[PDB]
Design a binder for this molecule. Structure first.
Ligand SMILES: *[C@@H]1O[C@H](CO)[C@@H](O)[C@H](O)[C@H]1NC(C)=O
Ligand SMILES: *[C@@H]1O[C@H](CO)[C@@H](O)[C@H](O)[C@H]1NC(C)=O
Lengths: 13, 210
């Protein structure tokens, strides 16, 4: 998922 | 000659940040072509299902700020540069089983902004056994590469060749290399996420006959 992807991740926060 | 190589370097890096993705317009993508050379198989660990390999990673891209007019520099069209002086695309092995010394490397920067960067790497990554396909003693090892920070609208990665480069491979004692086909995967989450690309090399090993 997006939130276990370092390119995405700080964006579910 | 060397006289002008210093002048060009100074002129190029007088106002240059190696932390800024080198595109003229910020919503333009920066394309990177990646090529993996399999130097040798250091250790195929069957008990822990971990492959340790020596690779050369060749990355190619354009830097929009590192261009020059050749006739302004006694026709100099190319210079070697320590890789850490230029912005670099930040591509890493995603399926690192390894939990963890960095090495100085050199790029070749061409007058039109094209940067070629050969760099060595020692990767450790998980493998899956296959006993179904002939000769039923198989190791399938995926090497997936992608950017640590950038999405596909910022840095997009493309395979240089259909497969890894095995022209300089050192034959392993126990394992034969059946192929190393490469593919590109682009992943989008939900309806509307931006794209997330990677390139995956599938090292197919069959146990050597003896
Ligand atoms: C990136 O590559 C694609 C082809 O794969 C091309 O259509 C596009 O124009 C390129 N973009 C830049 C900024 O070079
Ligand atoms: C290895 O990578 C290939 C290419 O993307 C993929 O199709 C395959 O399912 C992967 N295998 C495993 C076990 O992850």
């Amino acid at each position: 998922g997006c939130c276990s992807d370092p390119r995405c991740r700080y964006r579910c926060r | 000659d060397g006289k002008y190589a210093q002048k060009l370097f100074n002129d190029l890096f007088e106002d240059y940040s190696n932390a800024l993705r080198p595109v003229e317009d910020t919503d333009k993508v920066l394309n990177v072509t990646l090529q993996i050379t399999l130097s040798q198989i250091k250790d195929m660990d069957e008990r822990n299902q971990i492959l340790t390999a020596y690779l050369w990673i060749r990355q190619i891209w354009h830097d929009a700020y590192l261009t020059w007019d050749r006739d302004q520099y006694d026709g100099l069209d190319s210079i070697r540069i320590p890789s850490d002086l230029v912005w670099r695309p930040d591509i890493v092995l995603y399926n690192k089983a390894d939990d963890e010394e960095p090495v100085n490397t050199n790029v070749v920067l061409r007058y039109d902004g094209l940067i070629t960067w050969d760099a060595p790497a020692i990767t450790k990554s998980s493998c899956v056994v296959d006993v179904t396909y002939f000769p039923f003693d198989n190791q399938q090892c995926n090497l997936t590469f992608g950017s640590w920070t950038y999405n596909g609208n910022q840095v997009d990665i493309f395979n240089a060749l259909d497969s890894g480069d095995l022209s300089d491979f050192i034959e392993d004692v126990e394992w034969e290399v059946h192929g190393m086909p490469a593919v590109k995967n682009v992943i989008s989450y939900g309806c509307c996420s931006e794209p997330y690309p990677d390139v995956t090399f599938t090292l197919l090993l069959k146990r050597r006959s003896h």
